Ligand binder design. Structure first.
Ligand SMILES: [Mg+2]
Ligand SMILES: [Mg+2]
Ligand SMILES: [Mg+2]
Ligand SMILES: [Mg+2]
Ligand SMILES: [Mg+2]
Ligand SMILES: [Mg+2]
Ligand SMILES: [Mg+2]
Ligand SMILES: [Mg+2]
Ligand SMILES: [Mg+2]
Ligand SMILES: [Mg+2]
Ligand SMILES: [Mg+2]
Ligand SMILES: [Mg+2]
Ligand SMILES: [Mg+2]
Ligand SMILES: [Mg+2]
Ligand SMILES: [Mg+2]
Ligand SMILES: [Mg+2]
Ligand SMILES: [Mg+2]
Ligand SMILES: [Mg+2]
Ligand SMILES: [Mg+2]
Ligand SMILES: [Mg+2]
Ligand SMILES: [Mg+2]
Ligand SMILES: [Mg+2]
Ligand SMILES: [Mg+2]
Ligand SMILES: [Mg+2]
Ligand SMILES: [Mg+2]
Ligand SMILES: [Mg+2]
Ligand SMILES: [Mg+2]
Ligand SMILES: [Mg+2]
Ligand SMILES: [Mg+2]
Ligand SMILES: [Mg+2]
Ligand SMILES: [Mg+2]
Ligand SMILES: [Mg+2]
Ligand SMILES: [Mg+2]
Ligand SMILES: [Mg+2]
Ligand SMILES: [Mg+2]
Ligand SMILES: [Zn+2]
Lengths: 80, 177, 136, 116, 52, 66
RNA sequence: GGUGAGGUGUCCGAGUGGCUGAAGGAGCACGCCUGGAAAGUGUGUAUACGGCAACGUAUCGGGGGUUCGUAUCCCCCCCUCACCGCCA
RNA sequence: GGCUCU
RNA sequence: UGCCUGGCGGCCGUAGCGCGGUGGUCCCACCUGACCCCAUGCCGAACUCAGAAGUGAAACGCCGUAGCGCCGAUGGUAGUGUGGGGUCUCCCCAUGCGAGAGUAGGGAACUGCCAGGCAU
RNA sequence: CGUCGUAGUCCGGAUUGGAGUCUGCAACUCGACUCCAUGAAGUCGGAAUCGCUAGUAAUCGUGGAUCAGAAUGCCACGGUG
RNA sequence: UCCUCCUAAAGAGUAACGGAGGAGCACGAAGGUUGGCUAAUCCUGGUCGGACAUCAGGAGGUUAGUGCAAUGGCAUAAGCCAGCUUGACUGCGAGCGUGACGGCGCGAGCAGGUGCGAAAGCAGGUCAUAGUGAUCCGGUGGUUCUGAAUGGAAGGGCCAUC
RNA sequence: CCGACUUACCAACCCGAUGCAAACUGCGAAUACCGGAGAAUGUUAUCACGGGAGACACACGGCGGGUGCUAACGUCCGUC
């Protein structure tokens, strides 16, 4: 008999990711992306939350797009 | 601006000749003079720093900017933010008037003056020298002080090379050697 | 015995050894010992085959070793139940795919390199072959 | 250098008005002249424009790069904007200080009828 | 947990209070902030008092 | 420049032993009497004299005659 | 096998991040008394350093490390001290 | 007061 | 309509670097001065103001240039969904998808709105 | 009589550089002295320890022997006391 | 118990006495806003000054920084200076996310009143993700809501809070 | 003190070539998943509410893996 360990810990899964995909009609206030950083960025009719959460300010379809000189990823809401 | 007039009338014609510049804007010119006093011993007391800035304010009629540590080192017993030195930037007429009082008064008041070095031009025309003792300036009273400070002078000019600044200072009769 | 000086981590997963190799052609030297089989070698097997070809060439020529054992291998001790943490790092291996050039050699004739690499392959668990520098 | 730091100094408010959808007044300042232009919310085309480089404005002036020229420019661009029916804009200082010729321009445009 | 807790009493005569924390070692001077008082519907100076 | 923080910077006269009268702006206030100026400094004659190696053979031949 | 504590100049002994290259003491060297010694009494004291030898290198068990910085903090190696190594 | 050996 | 320049964009390296060359009527830039607006934890350096003597030196713009950066096929290879098989730590067959890297090669951006200048 | 006026000083004179004199065949190792400059330590000395009872101690100069030259040593002499 | 990465099989989620690290706070400014700024390291020269303080130029281009672990972000800076300040507001909240549930989270916008800014606007704590404990019982302030014949009161309720 | 040289004795940076990575990524699939449109098929196979449960000891096999010795009719996950 003998031994021990030191690597037993881990945290809970925060359920991040993309909640609504492209071409997918949403309501105002609908969470599109939950994320840690700004892996994506807020485009037209899309707000950025306190935790870099991307929510829809209006109603319509989700548009993923890459803009800017740095090729950053923007999310926009088309009208509907 | 006496030397500024002497530059504009005789030095520019001199250097345009001795370098064969196409344009007159291609000529060197002096831009600023920086007067540092690194006081690493003021962590003992502020008054050593506080009185050295008072001495350097008499030399150049500006209030000096008291500098601090960029980072923390333990070999010098300093933390990032301690006031550790003082600087003065001199431009314009006060630059020229200090450079006049320098090469006319203070350099002869150097103990055992025998010339400067022409190997102090930092590869890109900008000249830097260091004096051992502030009493060579007549601004400082000999009786009023107790402690021999020291400072260093850094002449930042627009000369690209090292020789264009060497000819520029030689045009100002700068005592190299 | 070859071994990494520093490591970012002390232990590693067992992984797999599937796929083809990349170090196929004789890059540096003239003759090569190419692995045909699949498996994992060790620092002992590498250093023993290096000694066997250094002695077989009488320090004539130049010998490259293309592989390096960087994977730590754990074992649990005797009379230890299967739980209670991962075992201790015991030795170091290099994963070998088919096609990997293991050793290279020049400055010697071909027949001497053949008998040297044969004495080396007799120290290796995997099946090898002899290759030469191909133009293109 | 100075041009680039001016652009960095301006490129936050330009993107902010870009997402606000704001019809935007762009000021540009030189030592000799001062420029103004009203830009559509797409940011790719203009509506009205005024400057001290125009003859109709410069011939009425002493120096093109003083405060009186800047007020004459903000007056001309405001009277042209209200002529074209553009009334509410948002002022882009374009990386300059809201001071001096820029402030005198915006005070002229406020006085002439624009709303910012 | 050296950062103790206090309350910010309205100076408008009402007993309304905000609750908050402070480091009493490093900030010995009293905290005074101008906060909204929902009873009077005005911004009123609140002052530090004891949490009791 | 700022208004109050700087010391007084006033034009005074500095005269020298060679009679080099020079008016400079300074923080001294009163007039200045010098000892050596750049005009009268022995940089152009004295520093030429001040090497003074001297000969060992010349001292030897100087001290006597054969 | 595992647990807990720990490794300091000749020795003992302080010291658990900021003159602690280290107290203090004993010891060692020098001196002084003694006919000589001891015991005394006073005075000093780590190791390689070299720039001229001023003061940085270094070393708290060895190796690694981080914090601006470690004798103290942490990590591996060991070495040693106390406990457990039971039931069948 | 106490103070060893040679 | 042509040329040049400035401003605001689109696009985000085939668009960037480098190297050489080139521009001053206008524009721009540097530049002159600062009692003033305003400013410097000192400094008219910057910011700002009042200006226009000078210069295109720098910067910027333009032209050229394959030292790079970048882009980049075709074919093959790796992988893999399903079904099947073997000598089953790993592979193969039918079928479908099909990279990355590399090669040939491309390549010294294109374009919109407004204003001004010189020509027409 | 004047001077310094409590300081490492107009104290102290070491050390060192340069220029010299003399003795002596000959002053490098290895002499004494002079001149100019240089201006250390040292601000009355731990434990411990020495001498001295009157012209004594203390202090001040002088001479001689030895010796070409070469003493702060030695042996003598007087002064103040 | 909680956080971060891998394992985790390119949506989410996913276990082991699997591999590695952290948390049980801090801040009345280290928050808000307005204005401005842009590193690390190295090279050369330079009084004391030295490997290493401070100063000037150049290379470099974020290899730095983020109050703390890691990951993801960060130049429009979320990083760094200064001015003014208290939005570290109260009542609400369309609509979604996430959990068996208790619960947790994001949130434009509305009403009042406020701060900065010329203004557009921004602000309902901090770059985000750890910094925590249900109910009961009891305490404190406020509030006529209730008040065992009635008027009060005790006590209770509601709000805030320990 | 200055160094004299030479000797390569090692070697930084940089350059070229070559490998390796679950906690590396200037690239990047197949599948899977989410959403939309459209046929054919399927005894609504879907969702909501309500009545009643049982069950929460799984096993092997294929594939992708952790651990173990790519040992176990071993163990722990995903999927069938
Ligand atoms: Mg028993
Ligand atoms: Mg005995
Ligand atoms: Mg006896
Ligand atoms: Mg200017
Ligand atoms: Mg040019
Ligand atoms: Mg292909
Ligand atoms: Mg490809
Ligand atoms: Mg190109
Ligand atoms: Mg080009
Ligand atoms: Mg006298
Ligand atoms: Mg003397
Ligand atoms: Mg002394
Ligand atoms: Mg004394
Ligand atoms: Mg004699
Ligand atoms: Mg006598
Ligand atoms: Mg996943
Ligand atoms: Mg998956
Ligand atoms: Mg912060
Ligand atoms: Mg800002
Ligand atoms: Mg340096
Ligand atoms: Mg944070
Ligand atoms: Mg209970
Ligand atoms: Mg009642
Ligand atoms: Mg009652
Ligand atoms: Mg991977
Ligand atoms: Mg049912
Ligand atoms: Mg159960
Ligand atoms: Mg179960
Ligand atoms: Mg199961
Ligand atoms: Mg399996
Ligand atoms: Mg098994
Ligand atoms: Mg099983
Ligand atoms: Mg298994
Ligand atoms: Mg199970
Ligand atoms: Mg299975
Ligand atoms: Zn003179």
């Amino acid at each position: 008999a003998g031994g021990s360990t030191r690597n037993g810990r881990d945290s809970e899964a925060k359920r991040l990711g993309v909640k609504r995909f492209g071409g997918e009609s949403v309501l105002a206030g609908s969470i599109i992306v939950r994320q840690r950083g700004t892996k994506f960025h807020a485009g037209a009719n899309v707000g950025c939350g306190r935790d870099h959460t991307l929510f829809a300010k209006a109603d319509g379809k989700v548009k993923f797009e890459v803009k800017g000189p740095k090729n950053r990823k923007f999310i926009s809401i088309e009208a509907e | 601006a006496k030397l500024h007039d002497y530059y504009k009338d005789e030095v520019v014609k001199k250097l345009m000749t001795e370098f064969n510049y196409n344009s007159v804007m291609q000529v060197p010119r002096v831009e600023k003079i920086t007067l540092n006093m690194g006081v690493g011993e003021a962590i003992a007391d502020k008054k050593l720093l506080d009185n050295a800035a008072a001495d350097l304010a008499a030399i150049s009629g500006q209030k000096p900017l008291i500098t601090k540590a960029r980072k923390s080192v333990a070999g010098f017993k300093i933390r990032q933010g301690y006031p550790i030195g003082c600087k003065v930037t001199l431009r314009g007429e006060r630059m020229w008037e200090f450079f006049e009082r320098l090469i006319t008064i203070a350099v002869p008041r150097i103990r055992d003056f025998r010339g400067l070095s022409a190997k102090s031009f930092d590869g890109r025309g900008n000249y830097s020298m260091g004096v051992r003792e502030q009493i060579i300036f007549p601004e400082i009273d000999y009786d009023k002080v107790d402690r021999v400070r020291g400072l260093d002078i850094t002449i930042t000019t627009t000369a690209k090379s090292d020789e264009e600044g060497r000819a520029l200072l030689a045009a100002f009769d700068f005592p190299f050697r | 015995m070859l071994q990494p000086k520093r490591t970012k981590f002390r232990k590693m997963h067992k992984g797999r050894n599937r796929g083809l190799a990349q170090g196929t052609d004789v890059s540096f030297g003239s003759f090569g010992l190419k692995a045909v089989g699949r498996g994992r070698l060790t620092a002992r097997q590498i250093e023993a085959a290096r000694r066997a070809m250094t002695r077989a060439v009488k320090r004539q020529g130049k010998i490259w070793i293309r592989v390096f054992p960087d994977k730590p291998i754990t074992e649990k001790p005797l009379a230890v139940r299967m739980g209670k943490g991962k075992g201790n790092v015991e030795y170091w291996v290099a994963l070998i795919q088919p096609g990997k050039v293991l050793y290279e050699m020049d400055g010697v004739p071909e027949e001497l390199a053949r008998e040297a690499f044969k004495l080396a392959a007799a120290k290796l668990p995997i099946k090898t072959t002899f290759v030469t520098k191909t133009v293109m | 250098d100075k041009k680039s730091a001016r652009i960095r100094r301006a490129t936050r408010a330009r993107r902010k008005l870009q997402e606000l959808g704001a019809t935007r007044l762009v000021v540009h300042r030189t030592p000799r002249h001062i420029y103004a232009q009203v830009i559509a919310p797409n940011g790719s085309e203009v509506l009205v424009a005024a400057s001290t480089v125009e003859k109709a404005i410069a011939e009425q002036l002493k120096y093109t790069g003083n405060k009186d020229a800047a007020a004459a420019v903000g007056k001309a661009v405001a009277e042209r904007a209200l002529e074209k029916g553009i009334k509410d804009v948002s002022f882009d200082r374009s990386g300059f200080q809201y001071h001096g010729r820029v402030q005198a321009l915006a005070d002229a445009a406020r006085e002439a009828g624009l709303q910012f | 947990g050296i950062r103790e807790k206090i309350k910010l009493v309205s100076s408008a005569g009402t007993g309304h209070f905000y609750t908050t924390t402070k480091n009493k070692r490093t900030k010995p001077e009293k905290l005074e902030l101008k906060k909204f008082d929902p009873v009077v519907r005005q911004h009123v100076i609140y002052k530090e008092a004891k949490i009791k | 420049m700022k208004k109050d923080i700087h010391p007084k910077y006033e034009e005074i006269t500095a005269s020298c032993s060679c009679g080099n009268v020079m008016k400079i702006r300074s923080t001294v206030g009163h007039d200045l009497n010098l000892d050596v100026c750049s005009k009268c400094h022995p940089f152009f004659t004295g520093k030429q004299r001040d090497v003074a190696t001297g000969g060992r053979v010349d001292r030897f031949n100087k001290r006597f005659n054969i």
